[PDB]
Design a protein around this ligand. Structure first.
Ligand code: ADP
Ligand code: ADP
Ligand code: BEF
Ligand code: BEF
Ligand code: MG
Ligand code: MG
Lengths: 49, 50, 164, 417, 100, 417
């Protein structure tokens, strides 16, 4: 829960930022998948007039 | 370990034991006394024979 | 939900004949009986539905006595050092919270006990307001006759009994 | 680990302390969450906690212990107390209590009071042996509360003229009548300083209702005493709440045979608050005040009296006039003949930047004969006769000069011969 | 007025309604052997505009719910077994019951 | 490709730029859709985007980055930020942030913040090491903010009389009390110009709530500073929204140890807005204002203070009086004794077309002794004593003449001897 670290910018900051970006992108993609599934299963279906 | 080592112990010696608050104490007083007996009694025939 | 509770307390016919406070007391009794019928063990529970500020929150009454039968509602008169009692009697706990008060059996027992409580309260009220006139001649039509007693109506659903 | 030990030290000490204790960044939380998390993490190491605070009764039955850091309001660090303790140990609003406390147990969110150790600086055993407030027999003020420092500093004049204009006593009823920006704040600060220096035995408390935060922060570090305040950042509900808190604290303390002195600033703000929190009763007069909207100010002010068995409650509030709105005036109107001592400050004198700007003959004290001796009373009458034919402004200047020549008022009185 | 799937079935006791839930649908795992109402379908027959106050009143006080017709669906006489799953589909707009 | 680079240049540059980039006719879209489509088509060529904006917290958890082009409102070019970034880097309302951004990804509609680079003109590494606002110890103003230009232009008089009527300091609490059409706009413009010239280190921001669009467009190109406004084209929801935006921006900046100066015009419009967006609480007094409808103006105004560790927040708002409706009056009423500095402009002086129309002795500053030196204070007292016996109008004319003869106020003071 404490990914926050920092020292020796040149490469450490680059790699840490790349990995944090991958992490947040993965979390956002999974949240998008969950929200799509929710909107899909909660969408009411037509039955008849 | 044994139940006979616990029936001879009034609940006065439980809430003083750590990690014994509300849920644990309620579970203990429920699952132990619902079988007819109770927690805290005076008996001398223990343990026969171990 | 609690919005349904407010709709119920506001959709009563005899509003002042049974005010919000005693309405919510009857509902507390309803939820207590419901929680009693939920668990196989017998345990007294107060609700305190929080008439206007918030929702309900069940509790766990102890009924402090030196007995141990069903220790869910048993605690000695001296257990006061830990769990912050510091008393001799009346020590009750607030362990279990947020029961369910809208399922089938809960709704059934609620409706039944509410009917009972409202009819009892209204009968006692219509009798008590006439109690101040004890020892006076009153009018009123009879309602029903029988071989043991008869019923009389003094107006505004005032039920009176006249024995044989 | 006591609650007050974290209650009084500034936020910076809390920061370094929590950063030492290996905490989540406490700089993201409020003072109350700071103390809450620090006490949490301290108890997580296995210590039994001690605490203190003033009790507030709730309508659900239970009570809550507040501190002067929150100005006696709801907070995460308030200590919950069951109604049954209030029953057995006879608790009520205003009872300050210190004793054994623990953090909220499993599923709770507020501290619990285990063991009572001090009720209003008394043994909880004798706390049940108390006398009520309304059953008291009030009296006039007999003991003199000398306000003169005697050191003869430059500002001390504003105190000596006190002893020459309107005497004070234990349990006095005083009203400060002055327009805005006339010098009430410096006067009140000098009053508090002189009382805390000459009478350190009586508890000193000050009310700031709907004031500026700079005045609050300057007051809380200028007087030697625990102060409470409420700025305009907050609704009038907070003002009335702190009003019951302070008035019940004073009541319980004087019931414990203690001399309480409250300096309220200002009663006009408190009247506005009481009027705006009270519901409409259909009884409206000029200004926009409800008829029952003044019952609460009348209650708060009539709380002042001098007890015979021991102790007293002096209440000195300032009222605002000449504010352009008639409503304020009406307030002052009903507070015209209710007080037996008044400090009248006219803006005409303060307009010349000559301080203190006090109207002498418009000020006075009822039944002041029992507060001073015969020589002092005769000299007061002579001074009043000398100052009466002259006006307000340069006559006040005359008093200021005659006061600045002498060191204390004994030399001034002897010179007046 | 449209139909309702509530649990207020008049002109019948509680034994026939003991297998119904709070919403008006038989529980998941409730056996049935004879003709038993397993869903509380009611339809209004006459005047509409039954006030919600009087609606909840009828469930507690007053008379029975008149415009119901007791058109609920029960299992045919002859089939037995235990229900294992219930399906419900709500059109966009109708209040979704808590079972859905 | 930065967001501000398209944020500040006018619509015409955007037109030619998009017409160069081979676009659908961008003249059919709004400014926000212009920037949105241009950034879309730029990223469609394969560039990683940079952006900036002020954060707004939403109740669903996530945040949105707004710009001053939309006056801090919802728009298609607002940058979405997840709540987890707000957690890790400790974000909140008012935190201006600039860093790596990308257009909304597949199926999204708002820009996403990749990498934080500047939090309130600071490293995001130290952004977590901040001090809160309410934990601050307020004080009085000590540092003087000289408003005089010294060049002696024709309009500069309206500034010099400032240094002669009501001194300003860092963290001052000032209220402009003037009837409509008396000259508040030119006064505020001169205030902004003088501050941006003499004190370019402190950030300068201005509030225009329910104003005319011509005044907004004249303000946004007369002062050297980023301005925000809200005309009457928009509901009061927009006004309260921009109110939180600006007040939280000022709060975060002063938490970052920066001196913020906000010029609000007018507080009467803001009070009307706050009253009309607040729901009814059953507490109505004269004028039609709810009792809790004023809690938000009280909050916004009490936000002003002088911090001790570093930085300050000066808030100078104008109030409207003599508008024929009692409601406005009541507003000014509760704002009567809340401020420690006031600029009183009477319509009687502005009626003669003599500017600036400032009421001298009705104006003043509380605790102004800590803002100026001893010589300056003594000269101020002498000037007040000279101007007091005379009236308002031609006495103001006398001050204007005595100011126009000398070049700066040093010569005026020496001549007053
Ligand atoms: N004892 C005193 N000595 C010197 N100046 C004083 C004294 N009392 C008041 N003042 C002047 O009065 C002003 C006080 O302002 P303030 O505290 O706001 O008054 P109020 O609280 O009555 O509105 C200061 O500018 C100060 O110069
Ligand atoms: N300080 C000043 N210098 C020059 N002209 C002024 C000044 N103050 C007011 N005026 C004149 O008065 C008018 C002010 O208009 P406006 O801004 O609407 O007044 P207010 O802001 O008081 O409502 C302008 O036409 C301007 O020519
Ligand atoms: F303190 Be001033 F009287 F507002
Ligand atoms: F801008 Be004006 F004073 F209405
Ligand atoms: Mg003051
Ligand atoms: Mg204008």
């Amino acid at each position: 829960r404490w990914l926050e670290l920092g020292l020796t910018d040149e490469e450490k900051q680059n790699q840490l930022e790349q990995l944090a970006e991958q992490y947040d992108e993965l979390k956002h993609e999974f949240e998008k998948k969950l929200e799509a599934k929710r909107r899909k299963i909660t969408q009411g279906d037509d039955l008849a007039p | 370990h044994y139940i006979g080592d616990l029936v001879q112990r009034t609940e006065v010696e439980l809430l003083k034991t750590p990690n014994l608050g509300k849920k644990s104490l309620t579970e203990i007083k429920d699952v132990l006394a619902s079988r007819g007996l109770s927690l805290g009694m005076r008996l001398e025939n223990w343990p026969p024979a171990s | 939900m609690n919005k349904e509770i407010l709709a119920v307390v506001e959709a009563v016919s005899n509003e002042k004949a049974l005010p919000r406070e005693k309405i919510f007391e009857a509902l507390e009794s309803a939820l207590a009986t419901a929680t009693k019928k939920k668990y196989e063990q017998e345990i007294d529970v107060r609700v305190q539905i929080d008439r206007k500020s918030g929702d309900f929150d069940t509790f766990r009454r102890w009924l402090v006595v030196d007995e141990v039968t069903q220790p869910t509602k048993e605690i000695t008169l001296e257990a006061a050092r830990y769990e912050d009692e510091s008393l001799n009697l009346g020590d009750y706990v607030e362990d279990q919270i947020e029961s369910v008060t809208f399922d089938r059996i809960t709704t059934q027992t609620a409706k039944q006990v509410i009917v009972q409580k409202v009819r009892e309260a209204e009968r006692a009220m219509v009798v008590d307001q006439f109690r101040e006139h004890e020892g006076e001649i009153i009018t009123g039509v009879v309602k029903k006759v029988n071989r043991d007693n008869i019923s009389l109506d003094l107006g505004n659903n005032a039920e009176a009994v006249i024995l044989r | 680990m006591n609650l007050t030990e974290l209650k009084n030290t500034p936020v910076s000490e809390l920061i370094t302390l929590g950063e030492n204790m290996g905490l989540e960044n406490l700089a993201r939380m409020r003072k109350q969450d700071i103390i809450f998390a620090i006490l949490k993490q301290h108890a997580k190491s296995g210590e039994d906690i001690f605490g203190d605070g003033v009790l507030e009764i709730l309508q659900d039955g239970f009570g809550f212990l507040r501190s002067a850091d929150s100005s006696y309001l709801a907070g995460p660090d308030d200590i919950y107390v069951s109604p049954s303790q209030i029953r057995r140990f006879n608790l009520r609003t205003g009872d300050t209590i210190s004793g054994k406390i623990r953090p909220p147990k499993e599923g709770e969110r507020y501290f619990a009071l285990l063991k009572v150790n001090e009720v209003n600086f008394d043994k909880p055993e004798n706390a049940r042996n108390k006398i009520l407030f309304e059953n008291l027999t009030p009296l006039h003020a007999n003991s003199r509360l000398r306000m003169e420092r005697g050191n003869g500093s430059t500002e001390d004049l504003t105190a000596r003229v006190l002893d020459l204009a309107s005497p004070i006593g234990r349990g006095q009823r005083g009203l400060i009548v002055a327009p805005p920006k006339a010098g009430k704040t410096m006067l009140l600060q000098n009053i508090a300083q002189s009382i805390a220096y000459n009478h350190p035995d009586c508890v000193l408390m000050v009310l700031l209702i709907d004031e500026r935060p700079e005045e609050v922060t300057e007051m809380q570090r200028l007087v030697k005493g625990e102060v409470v305040a409420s700025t305009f950042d907050e609704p009038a509900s907070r003002h009335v709440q702190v009003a019951e808190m302070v008035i019940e604290k004073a009541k319980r303390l004087v019931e414990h045979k203690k001399d309480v002195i409250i300096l309220l600033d200002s009663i006009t703000r408190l009247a506005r608050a009481y009027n705006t929190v009270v519901p409409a009763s259909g009884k409206v007069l000029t200004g926009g005040v409800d008829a029952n909207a003044l019952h609460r100010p009348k209650r708060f002010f009539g709380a002042a009296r001098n007890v015979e068995e021991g102790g007293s409650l002096t209440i000195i509030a300032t009222a605002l006039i000449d504010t352009g709105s008639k409503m304020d005036e009406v307030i002052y109107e009903e507070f015209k003949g209710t007080g037996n001592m008044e400090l009248h400050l006219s803006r005409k004198i303060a307009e010349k930047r000559v301080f203190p700007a006090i109207d002498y003959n418009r000020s006075g004290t009822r039944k002041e004969e029992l507060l001073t001796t015969q020589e002092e009373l005769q000299k007061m009458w002579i001074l009043r006769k000398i100052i009466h034919p002259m006006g307000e402004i340069d006559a006040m200047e005359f008093l200021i000069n005659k006061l600045a020549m002498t060191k204390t008022n004994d030399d001034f009185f002897e010179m007046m011969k | 007025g449209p139909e309702e799937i509530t649990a207020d079935i008049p002109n019948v006791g509680e034994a026939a309604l003991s297998k119904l839930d709070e919403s008006g649908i038989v529980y998941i795992g409730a056996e049935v052997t004879g003709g038993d109402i397993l869903v509380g379908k009611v339809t209004p027959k006459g005047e509409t505009q039954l006030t919600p106050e009087e609606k909840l009143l009828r469930a507690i006080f007053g008379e029975k719910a008149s415009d119901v017709k007791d058109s609920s669906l029960r299992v045919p006489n002859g089939v037995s077994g235990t229900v294992i799953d219930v399906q419900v589909f709500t059109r966009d707009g109708v209040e979704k019951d808590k079972r859905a």
